[PDB]
Amino acid sequence: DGLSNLARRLRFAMKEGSIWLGEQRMILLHTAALGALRKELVDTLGMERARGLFMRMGFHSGVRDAELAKTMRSGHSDFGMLEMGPCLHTIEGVVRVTPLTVDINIAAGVYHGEFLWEDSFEGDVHRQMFGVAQAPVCWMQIGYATGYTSALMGKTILYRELECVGCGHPHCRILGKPLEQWEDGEAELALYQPD
Amino acid sequence: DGLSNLARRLRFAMKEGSIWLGEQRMILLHTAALGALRKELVDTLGMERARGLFMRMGFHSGVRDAELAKTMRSGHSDFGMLEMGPCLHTIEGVVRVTPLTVDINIAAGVYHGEFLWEDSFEGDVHRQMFGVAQAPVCWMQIGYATGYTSALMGKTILYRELECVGCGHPHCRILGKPLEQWEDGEAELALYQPD
Ligand SMILES: [Zn+2]
Ligand SMILES: [Zn+2]
Numbered sequence: 001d002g003l004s005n006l007a008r009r010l011r012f013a014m015k016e017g018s019i020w021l022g023e024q025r026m027i028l029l030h031t032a033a034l035g036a037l038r039k040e041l042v043d044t045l046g047m048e049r050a051r052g053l054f055m056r057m058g059f060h061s062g063v064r065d066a067e068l069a070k071t072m073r074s075g076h077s078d079f080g081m082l083e084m085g086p087c088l089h090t091i092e093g094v095v096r097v098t099p100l101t102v103d104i105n106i107a108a109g110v111y112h113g114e115f116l117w118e119d120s121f122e123g124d125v126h127r128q129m130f131g132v133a134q135a136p137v138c139w140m141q142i143g144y145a146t147g148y149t150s151a152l153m154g155k156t157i158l159y160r161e162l163e164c165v166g167c168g169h170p171h172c173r174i175l176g177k178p179l180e181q182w183e184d185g186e187a188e189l190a191l192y193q194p195d
Numbered sequence: 196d197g198l199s200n201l202a203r204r205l206r207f208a209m210k211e212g213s214i215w216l217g218e219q220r221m222i223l224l225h226t227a228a229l230g231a232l233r234k235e236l237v238d239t240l241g242m243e244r245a246r247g248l249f250m251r252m253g254f255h256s257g258v259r260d261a262e263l264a265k266t267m268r269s270g271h272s273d274f275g276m277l278e279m280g281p282c283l284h285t286i287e288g289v290v291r292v293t294p295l296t297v298d299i300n301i302a303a304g305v306y307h308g309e310f311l312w313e314d315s316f317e318g319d320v321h322r323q324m325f326g327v328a329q330a331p332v333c334w335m336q337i338g339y340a341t342g343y344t345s346a347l348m349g350k351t352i353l354y355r356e357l358e359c360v361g362c363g364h365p366h367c368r369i370l371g372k373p374l375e376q377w378e379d380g381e382a383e384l385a386l387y388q389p390d
Contacts, residue, residue, distance in 0.1 A: 012202075012288070014288075015198070016314060017284075017291025017313070017314055018316075021225070024227060025225070025227075027224055027226060027288045027316055028205075028222070028224075028286070028287040029287070031219070031221065031222060032219060032259055036251060036252055036255045037252045041248075043389075045239070049239075053232065053235055053236075057231060058228070060225065061225045061228040065225075090209060090212045091207075091209065092223040093207070093212065093214030093220070093221055094212065096210070118212065119211055121222055194238070
């Protein structure tokens with residue numbers, strides 16, 4: 001699960017003013033600052049584009065952390081490498097993740113995962129800027145799960161929220177599965193690109 | 196000195212999936228993910244509008260940090276309270292700050308500050324994507340300095356970069372002083388408000 005094996009990779013070089021998570025440079029960013037950005041994007045670009053922007057930012061984060069996890073192979077169970085994703089997301093202060101059910105085989109291209117999200121920073125941030133939302137709103141967090149799992153699997157795995165604190169639900173709950181297996185699948189993939 | 200005691204204001208609450216700096220919730224975010232966002236914002240809104248968005252994001256960060264620093268006023272002169280700013284910015288992994296000249300008296304409305312910035316994450320990220328620019332580019336970093344100092348002084352203190360790594364300089368260098376003393380001060384102020 002890499003409950004800490006990952007933790008070695010997290011270094012604060014404060015005498016150099018830098019933070020590293022693996023080979024990736026990190027900053028500590030106030031959720032309030034991200035909130036202000038979110039409100040301006042929604043106001044300028046409307047809700048739909050803001051969502052795509054945040055999803056793509058999360059996707060880039062997720063892909064980077066998958067690259068980290070894959071360097072530390074050490075013959076880790078398809079299951080153990082997957083769980084490094086939830087750990088890194090938690091270590092990054094984004095959300096507290098509890099795997100509910102996870103069916104995975106990387107060589108076969110098989111993945112179905114369902115997860116519990118507690119204390120989602122994004123849903124809470126969205127509520128602060130917007131009040132409770134009418135649809136799930138953890139765009140960047142969903143982007144991350146998609147990016148990490150897709151890079152891990154070497155194939156497109158898309159996630160969606162089934163419930164969300166941003167909607168006034170008590171937690172978030174997510175489901176990921178291959179692109180092929182979403183009815184409205186590349187309706188979703190459209191919000192995972194640039195331009 | 197203060198870098199060490201201020202780092203003690205940072206808490207990792209992993210079992211609740213969160214990171215705290217003073218009272219503010221923080222996330223660890225990949226600079227590569229922020230860069231992808233910046234690239235998309237520049238592509239979709241243009242450099243000028245992107246600049247405002249990031250300056251305002253930074254402003255909100257700085258203003259929040261000001262409250263956290265003030266809380267620890269226990270034995271701290273106008274200089275000590277102002278130094279928490281550069282220190283927190285460094286702990287956040289944003290930039291490594293070396294104060295060059297700090298002239299501050301909050302009661303008197305006196306503020307003149309010059310700082311050296313090394314390893315600005317923002318300038319480094321910016322040039323990787325767009326190559327070197329003509330105007331300085333550390334928008335969010337300048338917004339932070341502006342928000343932090345302004346909230347501390349209770350009057351508007353703007354910062355501008357005299358040098359920037361995004362311009363081909365080896366370092367960034369900033370100057371902060373009251374609003375009335377800047378060439379296009381009122382224009383700048385407009386960048387810190389809605390569009
Ligand atoms: Zn959510
Ligand atoms: Zn700069």
